[PDB]
Amino acid sequence: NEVRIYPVDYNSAPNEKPIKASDNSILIDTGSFLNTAITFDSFAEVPILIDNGLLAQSQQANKQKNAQSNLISNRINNVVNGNDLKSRFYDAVSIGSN
Amino acid sequence: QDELKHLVRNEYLTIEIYSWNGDSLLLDAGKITERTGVKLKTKSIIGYHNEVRIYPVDYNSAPNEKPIKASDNSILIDTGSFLNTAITFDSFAEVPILIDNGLLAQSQQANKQKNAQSNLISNRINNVVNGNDLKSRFYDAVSIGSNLSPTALFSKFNDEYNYYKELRAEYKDLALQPPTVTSSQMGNAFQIANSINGLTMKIGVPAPFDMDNIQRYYFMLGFETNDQAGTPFPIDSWTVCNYLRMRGTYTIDGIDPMLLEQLKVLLETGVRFWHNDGTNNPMAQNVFKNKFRK
Amino acid sequence: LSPTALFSKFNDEYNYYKELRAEYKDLALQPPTVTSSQMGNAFQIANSINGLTMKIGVPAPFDMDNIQRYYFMLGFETNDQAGTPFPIDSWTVCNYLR
């Protein structure tokens, strides 16, 4: 048992055509389509009579999840400075013998 | 068009081959020879242990490469990466078995964490050159001449050099968004539920306005080529704009030395030529119409 | 009595060529994939490639030309301390010295 919930029309450019079978069902929805989607797993579990049965839920909990939180910005490394414009303006006015 | 054949690069255009189990290939758009487009080849084992490995063909493979083969003529080692950068389809499926206390190997595989690269760094990040030196040299060259013109001369200078170094992208993106890496305990089962049990290719393209900006940039600024000791190619090549940036020891016949120095510095800064169109303002034209032959 | 234009005749390939230097050296063309099949070596036996494979990565001809031109024109770096410079007229055409 598993559920995967994904946004629709997300990061999908207009005019995109979603592939479908003869049934007309949308096999591949437009956009990320589970590339960035929530994965609901382990609907539940209850202790079972059989002993020595390792809980697969325990193993899944041992597995570590990783999720991004913030996005970096491109312009961090390179930033332009306006001192050049001030210098050019000063030179332009000064060269005029004003 | 031919002018934009170079536009097929990793950052601008993305092609992503996804196996919904969680594995991804993220083939970079570049290095795909125009001779043969994307052509995936699969090597598989089916039996006691089942596995598929799908790799691009003629990818990062220089021409004249010879692929080793046996007497059967089968290609044992295909040219290029050849599974060094390839998608690994595993766990075709699994169903619960009657035998109890049988640890699911699929569970152990899901516990194992997959790692896939998403973006490429750029070499020139740490070291970046600044054009202030050229401006200082030009100012010194003009001033040492005792020219009665004021410093406002240097004000007429234009500096797109720094702006266009700024516009350069720090990180190139192979895929539009990072690939998710989580393997379901059941395994491939989920894909079978929706009848999508197979590889899926998705193409990411820039928006039309960004594409227009990229086209304008490349048409106006030419293509970078750090050739050493090479004669500049014929200036009158493209119809409209032929950007050129030289830096070397040269002298035009019958030229005043100071004018030669000014021309040298100005070219080092980078000068754009607009071909005449028999109009009042040939400098203003539809750049997109620029074509290869003059 | 010459003006500052004298300094304009100066040439500065020093900064350009420090810029051209590579930040990261690459041992392999692309990063090696690290994933071990559960079966193990089995897969390689399927295609009869059960053994080591050596692959050689070489620069493209134009990049090779650029590298050759660079080294021929700029010599080889050697931070010798308190050493007499070697005979200038060694190579046929170009003998860069700093």
Residue numbers in the entry:
A (entry chain Y): 344 to 441
B (entry chain Y): 295 to 588
C (entry chain Y): 442 to 539
What does the paper say about this structure?
Staphylococcal picoviruses are a group of strictly lytic, short-tailed bacteriophages with compact genomes that are attractive candidates for therapeutic use. Here, we report the structure of the complete virion of S. epidermidis–infecting phage Andhra, determined using high-resolution cryo–electron microscopy, allowing atomic modeling of 11 capsid and tail proteins. The overall structure of the Andhra virion follows that of other phages in this group, with an isometric head (capsid) around 500 Å in diameter (vertex to vertex), connected to a 400-Å-long, straight tail surrounded by 12 appendages. The head has icosahedral symmetry, with the tail attached to a portal structure located at 1 of the 12 fivefold vertices.
Although the tail knob was expected to form a hexamer with C6 symmetry, it was inconsistently aligned relative to the RBPs, with two possible orientations, differing by a 30° rotation. The tail knob consists of a hollow cylinder, 145 Å long and 110 Å wide, and is made up of a hexamer of gp12. gp12 has a complex, intertwined structure that is similar to those of the gp9 tail knob protein of phage ϕ29 (45) and the streptococcal phage C1 major tail protein gp12 (46), to which it could be aligned with RMSD = 1.1 Å for 212 of the 588 residues. The N-terminal part of gp12 forms a β-sandwich domain related to tail tube proteins from many members of the Siphoviridae and Myoviridae bacteriophages, connected to an elongated β sheet domain at the bottom of the hexamer via an extended connecting loop. Residues 393 to 500 form an extended α-helical loop (the “channel loop”) on the inside of the cylinder, which constricts the inner diameter to ≈12 Å, presumably preventing exit of the DNA and terminal proteins. The focused reconstruction of the distal tail also resolved the hooks at the end of the β-hairpins of the tail stem protein (gp16) dodecamer that were not seen in the C6 reconstruction of the whole tail. Penetration of the membrane might cause the tail tip to fall apart, allowing the α helices of gp10 to disengage from the tail knob, leading to a conformational change in the internal α helices in the knob, similar to that described for ϕ29 (45).
